[PDB]
């Protein structure tokens, strides 16, 4: 998923 750890 988004690599910053935040849901899409």
């Amino acid at each position, epitope marked *: *998923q*988004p*690599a*910053d*750890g*935040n*849901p*899409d």
Partner: antibody
Amino acid sequence: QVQLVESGGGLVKPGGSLRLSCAASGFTFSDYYMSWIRQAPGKGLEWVSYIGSSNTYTSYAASVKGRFTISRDNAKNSLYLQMNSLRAEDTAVYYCAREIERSGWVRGNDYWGRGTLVTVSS
Amino acid sequence: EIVLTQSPATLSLSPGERATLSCRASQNVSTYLAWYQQKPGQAPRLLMYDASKRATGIPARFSGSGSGTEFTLTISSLEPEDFAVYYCQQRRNWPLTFGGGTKVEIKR
């Protein structure tokens, strides 16, 4: 070769705390993101937590939110899992695993450690 | 959360036969799906990511397919070392989730 070696597992009383470590070698640790994945005895895999470039970027499974914290120290080529308020249901082998990244998205775990066993019991 | 179901939970096949393993998702995950192999006493091993990209060093007899909610892992001809447990993992959104696994055992 890429190697990931977990340590810090052992016996802990319910409600206690434990810190897992994962030492990385054979690649530039700071060029990769990481996850912890656990496996209760005789059960399937359960993702626990994920970390990106720094402690600023983390994500957690609902079952551990608020209790576990994933962190990294690139100078030591090490990943960590701080586990608080442990419960018997947290008993499992804990694996650290490297993530595949492309185009700003992580896509799977291409290298796994051998795991470290955490037992939560009185 | 995105729920993954692997059915059947056990496949009983002979060496040399074709194996078709299924993973179905409760929501659209596009091609963000990984497959893993695990043998008793060993850590999981990545087989497939982005649904169909073979991982490093994985034999060509392994191929992944699918998109959306239905995915397949196919072993064209089973070798002895292929009898193991297989897990899928969706990489579409946080939190990550796994299927329950499919065990491929030797029929005798």
